[PDB]
Each structure stands twice: as structure tokens, then as C-alpha cells.
Amino acid sequence: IPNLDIIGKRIEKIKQEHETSWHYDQDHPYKTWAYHGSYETKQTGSASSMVNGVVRLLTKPWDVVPMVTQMAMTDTTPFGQQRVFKEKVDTRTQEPKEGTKKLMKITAEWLWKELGKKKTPRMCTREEFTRKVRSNAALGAIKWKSAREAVEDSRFWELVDKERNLHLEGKCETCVYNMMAIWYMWLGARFLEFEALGFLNEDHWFSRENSLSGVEGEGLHKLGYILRDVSKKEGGAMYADDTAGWDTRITLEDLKNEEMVTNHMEGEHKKLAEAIFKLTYQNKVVRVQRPTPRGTVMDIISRRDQRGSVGTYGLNTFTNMEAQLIRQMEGEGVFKSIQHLTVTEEIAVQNWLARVGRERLSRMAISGDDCVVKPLDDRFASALTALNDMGKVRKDIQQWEPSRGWNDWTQVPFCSHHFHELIMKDGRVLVVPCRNQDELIGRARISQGAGWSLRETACLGKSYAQMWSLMYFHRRDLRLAANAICSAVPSHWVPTSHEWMTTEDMLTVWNRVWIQENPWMEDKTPVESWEEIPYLGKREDQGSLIGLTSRATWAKNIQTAINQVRSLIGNEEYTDYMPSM
Ligand SMILES: CC(=O)Oc1ccc2oc(=O)sc2c1
Ligand SMILES: CC(=O)Oc1ccc2oc(=O)sc2c1
Ligand SMILES: [Co+2]
Ligand SMILES: [Co+2]
Ligand SMILES: [Co+2]
Ligand SMILES: [Co+2]
Ligand SMILES: [Co+2]
Ligand SMILES: [Co+2]
Ligand SMILES: [Co+2]
Ligand SMILES: [Co+2]
Ligand SMILES: [Co+2]
Ligand SMILES: [Zn+2]
Ligand SMILES: [Zn+2]
């Protein structure tokens, strides 16, 4: 089942740009994706990640930690792409049963209606898009060189209009994904997607206020508070099951339910969004590279159901909200059979959604595929037939083994973190985020771009340091490492583009984020120094693999390393920041 009436125009346009080498490789490796052909291509990508030499020189004890080192070994060569494709992306998900589909359709229709109560969809503009391009951007493959180049060249916008008018007659020609697993599109295709669906992000449809379950806009320093509030609900344990490869488990049915947001639109906006949904989401064309004994080729493949990562405009959050409501329903015995929803069962679901729907959403904190649920009681743990039949198979657990929850919200994993209460010297109680400090250091030692000069490398380092001092100040090693990086990088250099991304005094930012603007901090008295700001317990702070001897030596000689970095940056002026205790 590949529908060439929808994808043929895209495939033929690519075939015609490489007619000489175009061919059908009878030994292609694709099993659940439809394969259309290959052509010869120049190898792109690389098999190493680039190391941030500034962060590395100031974090020398971590040169021997395995987690840290391994993180610097990403493979975007054809070899790497094909490795991840075979293991992760080339999977099939069964179609949900009839009953499951009915639950999803009812629940999705209800959810769009709740999200739309206080919001109205709208088209986003070329001007909105262009302003966002002048900053951090969603990721498209880039004929110009940068996104900021394309937005000014008005020929770029003629191409947009060309594709847009095809979209307006239900045809698609250039919206092709590239697996260079992350999927890129031409910036023009990204614009059309933004124009149709950007309102979901820009108008904050998944903020906690509008969606009850969501946390769009919250910010790491707020998530722990949000978890602790959810824990105040009456109910069972708190559950936080990860889905194995969520993007690959998005079904065609999921995509059709997300599309019901178009029922809330009108005019050409509805037509454009319908094009994004039917032409680019439910009928995708993907380019992947593959090594062959004859050099690297590009494969053209297609598939209807999965999702490709930029975010997903809240659609992953939407679908997870829907999926977790249905698991709540199943736990509460609202329905009995995935096989067939009886007429009286469809009415119960409708009643349940009308009666307790909003309350059940607020038992949840959901960010894309990341969810925390505090259900009515622990029947939830073994309500599994809808979850599995929807394809949202739980990671690292037997299919019918019941979920394990937690009674202590400080043990619940959410958004790659745990959250802890932390007592200040004056007795006020902070809720702070926590995650393995060897991961944080490993990610800081990776320069997110290839071929970078030392200034941008130093500014990326400073960005992590300021983030550490805001978010992970309670970790002794990170506070010290942040101090060194900030001492080593000229004080007026701007961190690369969030609260840590200026040259504001970071104590000023700390006070604003954790005291002044913290809705869960009643006493608005600021702190007057970093010595006033506490650490986690020395025990629980140990979490790190580094030896105590190499940490002590690192701490004792840290100024030697700082000066070494200062010398390579240049005859500049630097500030010696308050040394961590
Ligand atoms: C937009 C929002 O507030 O939701 C999230 C989800 C995951 C996450 O991981 C971080 O580092 S911050 C963060 C925020
Ligand atoms: C706890 C500590 O002293 O670490 C930092 C980190 C970043 C920063 O940015 C400034 O201007 S001050 C400052 C201190
Ligand atoms: Co050719
Ligand atoms: Co080529
Ligand atoms: Co996974
Ligand atoms: Co169909
Ligand atoms: Co209309
Ligand atoms: Co999302
Ligand atoms: Co009740
Ligand atoms: Co950052
Ligand atoms: Co509050
Ligand atoms: Zn298109
Ligand atoms: Zn911890």
C-alpha cells in the first residue's frame, strides 16, 4: 500500500533530478517501509561528535568516565543512519482493534473541544516565521546556506508560494523528509507546516492552564513543583511509564485523530492544515543514505503511519494525553473490551469524559512522550489492553506485567529528571531538578557544531555553566565547574542563544527564578550571596563516578586550568568568581 496519487509527484521530481543513476536496488534492506528507488549521492554526516575543548580542559577528571566519553560518538554517516534505521525505525505497528479506534475517536474529539474552549486556531505569518528564524530555529535541511539567508531572498518565498498553491489544490511536490534519528525538511516545507499548525505552540494550546495535563512553557525549575502538586491528589501510586520508541509507534489512526483539530478551523487555513496532515504526515516520502559496495546511495522510501522529529507542535502531547485518559478509563472499568465498544459503553465513555474528564487531565503532567499520571487508584497499573493495542508499548517491561509506580513524588522520573526538596539556610524549601551529573558534563563537553572557532565554543561552554548555576547549583561539582568556566570565559561574551542566556549576574537571575517569580515561594526575601544557596547532602550529591582523589586535586588546582584557558583565549580581562566552598 503506497499511494502514488499522493506521493508520486514527490518521487518523480526526485527521480528526474537523478535519472542517470536512478535504479531499483534489489538488495535494499527495507522491510516495513515501501522502497521506491535509489540514486548515487555524495556521503554526508560524520561518525564523531566534536569536543568542546574549553569545557574539557576545566572538567579533566571526567576524561576517564565512560558515560562522558561515549556521548561524544554519534554517527551520522550512511553507516550510522542505516544502523539506527534497522534497529529503531523499520518496525511495524499493528492497527488498533475496532473498540480501541472508537475510544480514540471519541476521546480525541472531546480533547480538541476542551483545548479549543478558550483558544481559536489561526494561520501564522511569514513575519512570525521570519522573526523566529532570527534565533534558535526548528531544524530544516539547507540553494542558499542559512535559514536567515532564505528568509530574505524573495525567490525563496516564490518557491513557498509554488508549493503552497499545490497544497491549496491538494497536491504536494517538495515536502520530503531527510534522515540526516532526526528528519529534516526543506525550510519552505517547514514554513508551510508552521503556517498551518504553528498556532498550537505560539498560542500555547498545551500550557497547563489550557490543557491541564500539559506543561508547555513551564521550565525545568517549575516541573518539580508541578509534580508535587499532582501528588497532593487523592489516588494511587504515581506512574511514569516510558514508551519504547514513541515516534515509531504513532499510528495512522493517531494521525487521523490529531487531524481532527482541523474541524476547529475554517477557510484556507483549514485547507492548508488538511494538506499538512494528509500530504506530509499521513503520506510521507523519506530520503535516507545507505552504504553499498559501490559507494553511498540515497534511498527514497515511504510510509503512512510513523512520526518524524523542532518539536511536533504539541501533537505528541495531544496523543499521549488521549492515550493516558484511555488507560485511566480502562483502569476505572469504564469499558470492558478492546474488541468492540458496545453502544452503552460508548455512552459511558462519553459520560465519564463529561463528568470527570477535566479532573483526570489534571492528574497528569505530560510533555510529548513523557508522562506522569496519578490515577484514581492502582487498577491503572494493570489496565494494559488499550495501551498495548494502541501501540504505546511500555519500555523495558514484559507486555502484560503491571506497571510499577511510586509513593514518593521525589522518586518519579519526569523529563529525564528527578526532583527533590532542598532546605535553604533560612528554612524555606525549594524543589530542585536533579539528574546524573556525568550526563550533564558529558553533554557540556560536546560542541553542537562542526568547524567552530574558540569564541563560539567558549560561549557554548558559558551557556552550560550558567544553566548549571541556575538549575543544578545544588551539585558541588557542577557549581565549581560552572565557576571555572565563567571565570575562564571573558565576562562580557554572550552565551549562545532561557534565563541563563545573558550576561546578567547569575545571582540576580537565581533570585528572580527561585524567589521573586516562583509561585511556590511565599516569602519573597532574596538571598545575598552564593554561600547562602545550599547544596544537596554531601552523600546524595555523590551522582558522580569520579574518584575523590582526582576530584580533590581538580578542585585544588582549578585556577591553573582556568588560567590555561585564559591564555589560549587571549590577553583579555576575566573575573575571578566566588570560589565554591
Ligand atoms: C516546555 C516544557 O516546560 O516542558 C519540558 C519538557 C522536558 C524538559 O527537559 C528540560 O531540560 S526542560 C523541559 C521542559
Ligand atoms: C555559583 C557561581 O558562582 O557560579 C556562577 C556561574 C555563572 C555566573 O555569571 C555571573 O555573572 S556570576 C556567576 C557565577
Ligand atoms: Co545522477
Ligand atoms: Co546528491
Ligand atoms: Co527508545
Ligand atoms: Co485512508
Ligand atoms: Co470553511
Ligand atoms: Co511535543
Ligand atoms: Co470521582
Ligand atoms: Co543550554
Ligand atoms: Co501555585
Ligand atoms: Zn508539499
Ligand atoms: Zn539525584
Author numbering: 271 to 412, 418 to 455, 473 to 601, 604 to 791, 801 to 845, 848 to 886
What did the publication describing this PDB structure actually write?
Non-structural protein 5 (NS5) is the largest viral protein, comprising the N-terminal methyltransferase (MTase) domain and the C-terminal RNA-dependent RNA polymerase (RdRp) domain. The RdRp domain is essential for both positive- and negative-strand RNA syntheses during replication. The structure of RdRp is often compared to a right hand, and is composed of three subdomains: thumb, fingers, and palm. The thumb subdomain contains a so-called priming loop, which extends into a double-stranded RNA binding site, and is hypothesized to undergo a conformational change during the de novo initiation of RNA synthesis.
In order to understand the inhibitory mechanism of RK-0404678, the crystal structures of the NS5 RdRp domains from DENV2 and DENV3 were determined in the complex form with RK-0404678 at 2.43 and 1.97 Å resolutions, respectively. The DENV2 RdRp structure revealed two RK-0404678 molecules bound to two distinct sites (Sites 1 and 2), while the DENV3 RdRp structure showed only one molecule of the compound bound to Site 1. In the DENV2 RdRp structure, the benzoxathiole ring of RK-0404678 is surrounded by the side chains of Cys780, Tyr882, Met809, Ser763, and Asp808, while the acetate group interacts with the side chains of Trp833, Arg773, Met883, and Asn777 (right). The DENV2 RdRp structure revealed the second binding site (Site 2) for RK-0404678. This site is within the RNA-binding cleft, close to the catalytic Asp residues on the palm subdomain. The benzoxathiole ring of RK-0404678 interacts with the side chains of Val507, Ser661, and Cys709 and the main chains of Glu510-Gly511. A comparison of the DENV2 RdRp structures with and without the bound RK-0404678 revealed that the compound binding induces a local conformational change in the RdRp. While Tyr607 on the α16 helix faces the catalytic center in the absence of the compound, it is flipped in the opposite direction upon compound binding. This change affects the structures of the α16-helix and its flanking loop, which are disordered in the presence of the compound. A cobalt ion included in the crystallization conditions occupies the space left after the flipping of the Tyr607 side chain.
